[PDB]
Every structure is written in C-alpha cells, then in structure tokens.
Short mmCIF file of all heavy atoms in Angstrom, two decimals:
data_model
loop_
_atom_site.label_atom_id
_atom_site.label_comp_id
_atom_site.label_asym_id
_atom_site.label_seq_id
_atom_site.Cartn_x
_atom_site.Cartn_y
_atom_site.Cartn_z
N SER B 1 2.13 6.54 30.27
CA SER B 1 0.70 6.35 30.32
C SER B 1 0.24 5.46 29.16
O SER B 1 0.96 5.26 28.18
CB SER B 1 -0.03 7.70 30.26
OG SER B 1 0.33 8.42 29.10
N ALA B 2 -0.97 4.93 29.29
CA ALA B 2 -1.54 4.11 28.24
C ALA B 2 -1.91 4.96 27.04
O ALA B 2 -2.41 6.08 27.17
CB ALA B 2 -2.77 3.36 28.75
N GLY B 3 -1.63 4.43 25.85
CA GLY B 3 -1.90 5.10 24.60
C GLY B 3 -2.56 4.16 23.61
O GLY B 3 -3.20 3.18 23.97
N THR B 4 -2.39 4.48 22.32
CA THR B 4 -2.97 3.69 21.25
C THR B 4 -1.98 3.56 20.10
O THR B 4 -1.06 4.37 19.95
CB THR B 4 -4.28 4.29 20.71
OG1 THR B 4 -4.10 5.68 20.41
CG2 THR B 4 -5.40 4.12 21.73
N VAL B 5 -2.18 2.52 19.30
CA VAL B 5 -1.44 2.38 18.04
C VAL B 5 -1.88 3.49 17.09
O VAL B 5 -3.09 3.65 16.85
CB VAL B 5 -1.69 1.00 17.44
CG1 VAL B 5 -0.87 0.82 16.17
CG2 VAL B 5 -1.37 -0.10 18.45
N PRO B 6 -0.96 4.26 16.53
CA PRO B 6 -1.37 5.38 15.66
C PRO B 6 -1.92 4.88 14.34
O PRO B 6 -1.88 3.69 14.02
CB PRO B 6 -0.07 6.16 15.46
CG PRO B 6 1.00 5.13 15.61
CD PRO B 6 0.50 4.16 16.65
N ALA B 7 -2.46 5.82 13.57
CA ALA B 7 -2.98 5.50 12.25
C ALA B 7 -1.85 5.03 11.34
O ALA B 7 -0.66 5.27 11.59
CB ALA B 7 -3.68 6.70 11.64
N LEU B 8 -2.23 4.34 10.27
CA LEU B 8 -1.26 3.79 9.33
C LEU B 8 -0.77 4.86 8.37
O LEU B 8 -1.43 5.88 8.15
CB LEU B 8 -1.89 2.63 8.57
CG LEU B 8 -2.00 1.33 9.38
CD1 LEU B 8 -3.11 0.45 8.85
CD2 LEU B 8 -0.67 0.59 9.36
N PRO B 9 0.41 4.66 7.78
CA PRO B 9 0.93 5.63 6.80
C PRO B 9 0.04 5.70 5.57
O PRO B 9 -0.82 4.85 5.32
CB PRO B 9 2.32 5.10 6.47
CG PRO B 9 2.69 4.23 7.63
CD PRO B 9 1.41 3.62 8.10
N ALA B 10 0.27 6.73 4.77
CA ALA B 10 -0.51 6.95 3.57
C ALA B 10 -0.14 5.93 2.49
O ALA B 10 0.83 5.18 2.61
CB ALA B 10 -0.31 8.37 3.04
N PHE B 11 -0.95 5.90 1.44
CA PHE B 11 -0.68 5.02 0.30
C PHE B 11 0.62 5.44 -0.38
O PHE B 11 1.00 6.61 -0.39
CB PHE B 11 -1.83 5.07 -0.70
CG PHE B 11 -3.10 4.43 -0.21
CD1 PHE B 11 -4.31 5.07 -0.36
CD2 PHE B 11 -3.07 3.19 0.41
CE1 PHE B 11 -5.48 4.48 0.09
CE2 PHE B 11 -4.23 2.60 0.86
CZ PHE B 11 -5.44 3.25 0.71
N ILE B 12 1.31 4.45 -0.96
CA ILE B 12 2.54 4.68 -1.71
C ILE B 12 2.30 4.53 -3.21
O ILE B 12 2.48 5.48 -3.98
CB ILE B 12 3.67 3.74 -1.23
CG1 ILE B 12 3.98 4.01 0.24
CG2 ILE B 12 4.91 3.93 -2.09
CD1 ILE B 12 4.98 3.03 0.84
N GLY B 13 1.88 3.34 -3.65
CA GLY B 13 1.55 3.15 -5.04
C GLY B 13 0.21 3.75 -5.41
O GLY B 13 -0.67 3.97 -4.57
N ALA B 14 0.05 4.04 -6.70
CA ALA B 14 -1.17 4.64 -7.21
C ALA B 14 -2.24 3.61 -7.56
O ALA B 14 -3.37 4.00 -7.88
CB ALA B 14 -0.87 5.49 -8.45
N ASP B 15 -1.93 2.32 -7.50
CA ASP B 15 -2.83 1.27 -7.95
C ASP B 15 -3.16 0.32 -6.80
O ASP B 15 -2.36 0.12 -5.89
CB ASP B 15 -2.22 0.47 -9.11
CG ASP B 15 -1.83 1.36 -10.28
OD1 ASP B 15 -2.61 2.27 -10.63
OD2 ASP B 15 -0.74 1.15 -10.84
N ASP B 16 -4.36 -0.26 -6.87
CA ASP B 16 -4.79 -1.33 -5.97
C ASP B 16 -4.65 -0.93 -4.50
O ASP B 16 -4.09 -1.66 -3.68
CB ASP B 16 -4.02 -2.62 -6.27
CG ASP B 16 -4.02 -2.97 -7.74
OD1 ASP B 16 -5.01 -2.65 -8.43
OD2 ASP B 16 -3.03 -3.57 -8.21
N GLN B 17 -5.17 0.25 -4.17
CA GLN B 17 -5.06 0.78 -2.82
C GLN B 17 -6.11 0.15 -1.91
O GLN B 17 -7.30 0.18 -2.21
CB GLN B 17 -5.22 2.30 -2.84
CG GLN B 17 -4.26 3.01 -3.78
CD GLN B 17 -4.49 4.50 -3.83
OE1 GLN B 17 -5.60 4.98 -3.58
NE2 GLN B 17 -3.45 5.26 -4.14
N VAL B 18 -5.65 -0.42 -0.79
CA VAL B 18 -6.53 -1.02 0.21
C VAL B 18 -6.02 -0.63 1.59
O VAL B 18 -4.83 -0.79 1.88
CB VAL B 18 -6.60 -2.56 0.09
CG1 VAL B 18 -7.79 -3.09 0.87
CG2 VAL B 18 -6.68 -3.00 -1.37
N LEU B 19 -6.92 -0.13 2.44
CA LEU B 19 -6.58 0.23 3.81
C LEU B 19 -7.54 -0.47 4.76
O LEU B 19 -8.75 -0.26 4.69
CB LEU B 19 -6.64 1.75 4.02
CG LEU B 19 -6.54 2.22 5.48
CD1 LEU B 19 -5.16 1.92 6.06
CD2 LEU B 19 -6.86 3.71 5.59
N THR B 20 -7.00 -1.30 5.65
CA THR B 20 -7.76 -1.95 6.70
C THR B 20 -7.31 -1.40 8.05
O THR B 20 -6.55 -0.43 8.14
CB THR B 20 -7.59 -3.47 6.62
OG1 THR B 20 -6.29 -3.83 7.10
CG2 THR B 20 -7.74 -3.95 5.19
N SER B 21 -7.79 -2.04 9.12
CA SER B 21 -7.35 -1.68 10.46
C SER B 21 -5.98 -2.25 10.80
O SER B 21 -5.39 -1.86 11.81
CB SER B 21 -8.36 -2.15 11.50
OG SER B 21 -8.44 -3.57 11.53
N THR B 22 -5.44 -3.15 9.97
CA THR B 22 -4.20 -3.84 10.27
C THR B 22 -3.11 -3.66 9.21
O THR B 22 -1.97 -4.06 9.47
CB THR B 22 -4.45 -5.34 10.46
OG1 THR B 22 -5.24 -5.84 9.38
CG2 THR B 22 -5.18 -5.59 11.78
N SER B 23 -3.42 -3.07 8.06
CA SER B 23 -2.40 -2.87 7.03
C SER B 23 -2.86 -1.79 6.06
O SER B 23 -4.04 -1.44 6.01
CB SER B 23 -2.10 -4.17 6.28
OG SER B 23 -3.16 -4.51 5.40
N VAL B 24 -1.90 -1.28 5.30
CA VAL B 24 -2.15 -0.33 4.22
C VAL B 24 -1.40 -0.83 2.99
O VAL B 24 -0.17 -0.98 3.03
CB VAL B 24 -1.73 1.10 4.59
CG1 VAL B 24 -0.23 1.19 4.84
CG2 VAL B 24 -2.15 2.07 3.51
N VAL B 25 -2.13 -1.11 1.92
CA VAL B 25 -1.58 -1.77 0.74
C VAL B 25 -1.78 -0.88 -0.48
O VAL B 25 -2.88 -0.35 -0.69
CB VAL B 25 -2.22 -3.15 0.52
CG1 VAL B 25 -1.76 -3.76 -0.80
CG2 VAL B 25 -1.88 -4.08 1.68
N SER B 26 -0.73 -0.72 -1.27
CA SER B 26 -0.79 -0.02 -2.55
C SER B 26 0.17 -0.71 -3.51
O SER B 26 0.95 -1.58 -3.12
CB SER B 26 -0.46 1.46 -2.39
OG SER B 26 0.83 1.63 -1.82
N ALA B 27 0.10 -0.32 -4.78
CA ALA B 27 0.90 -0.99 -5.79
C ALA B 27 1.18 -0.05 -6.96
O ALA B 27 0.42 0.89 -7.22
CB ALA B 27 0.21 -2.26 -6.30
N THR B 28 2.28 -0.32 -7.66
CA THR B 28 2.65 0.37 -8.88
C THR B 28 2.78 -0.65 -10.00
O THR B 28 3.52 -1.63 -9.88
CB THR B 28 3.97 1.14 -8.72
OG1 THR B 28 3.82 2.17 -7.74
CG2 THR B 28 4.39 1.76 -10.05
N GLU B 29 2.05 -0.42 -11.09
CA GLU B 29 2.09 -1.31 -12.24
C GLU B 29 3.24 -0.94 -13.17
O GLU B 29 3.76 0.18 -13.15
CB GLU B 29 0.77 -1.28 -13.00
CG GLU B 29 -0.42 -1.80 -12.22
CD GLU B 29 -1.73 -1.63 -12.97
OE1 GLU B 29 -1.70 -1.07 -14.09
OE2 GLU B 29 -2.78 -2.05 -12.45
N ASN B 30 3.63 -1.90 -14.00
CA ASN B 30 4.61 -1.68 -15.06
C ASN B 30 4.47 -2.76 -16.11
O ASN B 30 5.22 -3.74 -16.11
CB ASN B 30 6.03 -1.65 -14.48
CG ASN B 30 7.06 -1.13 -15.48
OD1 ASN B 30 6.94 -1.33 -16.69
ND2 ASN B 30 8.07 -0.44 -14.96
N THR B 31 3.51 -2.59 -17.03
CA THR B 31 3.29 -3.57 -18.08
C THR B 31 4.40 -3.58 -19.13
O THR B 31 4.49 -4.55 -19.90
CB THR B 31 1.95 -3.32 -18.77
OG1 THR B 31 1.98 -2.05 -19.43
CG2 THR B 31 0.83 -3.32 -17.75
N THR B 32 5.24 -2.55 -19.18
CA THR B 32 6.36 -2.54 -20.11
C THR B 32 7.46 -3.49 -19.67
O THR B 32 8.03 -4.22 -20.49
CB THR B 32 6.90 -1.12 -20.27
OG1 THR B 32 5.85 -0.26 -20.72
CG2 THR B 32 8.04 -1.09 -21.28
N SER B 33 7.78 -3.50 -18.37
CA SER B 33 8.78 -4.43 -17.84
C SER B 33 8.17 -5.71 -17.29
O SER B 33 8.88 -6.71 -17.16
CB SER B 33 9.59 -3.75 -16.73
OG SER B 33 8.85 -3.68 -15.53
N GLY B 34 6.87 -5.71 -16.98
CA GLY B 34 6.25 -6.87 -16.39
C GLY B 34 6.53 -7.05 -14.91
O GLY B 34 6.36 -8.16 -14.39
N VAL B 35 6.95 -5.99 -14.22
CA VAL B 35 7.23 -6.04 -12.79
C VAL B 35 6.09 -5.36 -12.05
O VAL B 35 5.74 -4.20 -12.34
CB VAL B 35 8.57 -5.37 -12.46
CG1 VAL B 35 8.79 -5.33 -10.96
CG2 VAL B 35 9.71 -6.11 -13.15
N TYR B 36 5.50 -6.07 -11.10
CA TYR B 36 4.40 -5.57 -10.28
C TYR B 36 4.92 -5.34 -8.87
O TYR B 36 5.34 -6.29 -8.20
CB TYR B 36 3.23 -6.55 -10.29
CG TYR B 36 2.03 -6.15 -9.45
CD1 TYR B 36 1.21 -5.10 -9.83
CD2 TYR B 36 1.71 -6.85 -8.29
CE1 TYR B 36 0.11 -4.74 -9.07
CE2 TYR B 36 0.62 -6.50 -7.52
CZ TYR B 36 -0.18 -5.44 -7.92
OH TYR B 36 -1.27 -5.09 -7.15
N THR B 37 4.92 -4.09 -8.43
CA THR B 37 5.46 -3.70 -7.14
C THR B 37 4.33 -3.48 -6.15
O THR B 37 3.41 -2.70 -6.41
CB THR B 37 6.31 -2.43 -7.26
OG1 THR B 37 7.32 -2.62 -8.25
CG2 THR B 37 6.97 -2.10 -5.93
N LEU B 38 4.40 -4.16 -5.01
CA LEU B 38 3.37 -4.11 -3.98
C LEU B 38 3.96 -3.54 -2.70
O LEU B 38 4.97 -4.05 -2.20
CB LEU B 38 2.78 -5.50 -3.73
CG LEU B 38 1.49 -5.61 -2.91
CD1 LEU B 38 0.29 -5.17 -3.73
CD2 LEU B 38 1.31 -7.02 -2.38
N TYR B 39 3.33 -2.50 -2.16
CA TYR B 39 3.78 -1.84 -0.95
C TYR B 39 2.83 -2.18 0.20
O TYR B 39 1.62 -1.97 0.09
CB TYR B 39 3.84 -0.32 -1.14
CG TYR B 39 4.64 0.13 -2.34
CD1 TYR B 39 4.01 0.55 -3.50
CD2 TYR B 39 6.03 0.14 -2.31
CE1 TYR B 39 4.73 0.96 -4.60
CE2 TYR B 39 6.77 0.55 -3.41
CZ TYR B 39 6.11 0.96 -4.55
OH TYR B 39 6.84 1.37 -5.65
N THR B 40 3.39 -2.69 1.29
CA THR B 40 2.62 -3.03 2.48
C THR B 40 3.28 -2.42 3.70
O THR B 40 4.49 -2.56 3.89
CB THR B 40 2.50 -4.54 2.66
OG1 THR B 40 2.13 -5.15 1.42
CG2 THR B 40 1.45 -4.87 3.71
#
C-alpha cells in the first residue's frame, strides 16, 4: 500500500543543530584539535 517517508533521525552532535523537511544536521566542535565534525 501507499505510505510516506518517515521522520528523520534525531540529532547526533550537540552543536549547530538544524532540522528541515529534507535533512537533519548537527555538529561536534573541537577547538583543541581544530577538527569540526558535521553529521548529516
């Protein structure tokens, strides 16, 4: 039968959280190492 695209997963990173109808974006900072991790 016809259905729908389910909701997006929860946020992963604690920083820069953005949720739209097409993506879910979060991030983890690390100013000690200088590596910025972005989860999409």
Side-chain angles (χ1 to χ4, degrees):
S1 58
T4 50
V5 183
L8 283 155
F11 291 133
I12 299 174
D15 304 317
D16 310 329
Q17 305 177 334
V18 195
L19 170 66
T20 74
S21 65
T22 49
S23 73
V24 63
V25 173
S26 58
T28 296
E29 295 175 358
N30 193 326
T31 65
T32 302
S33 76
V35 175
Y36 179 71
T37 305
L38 192 75
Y39 308 103
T40 313

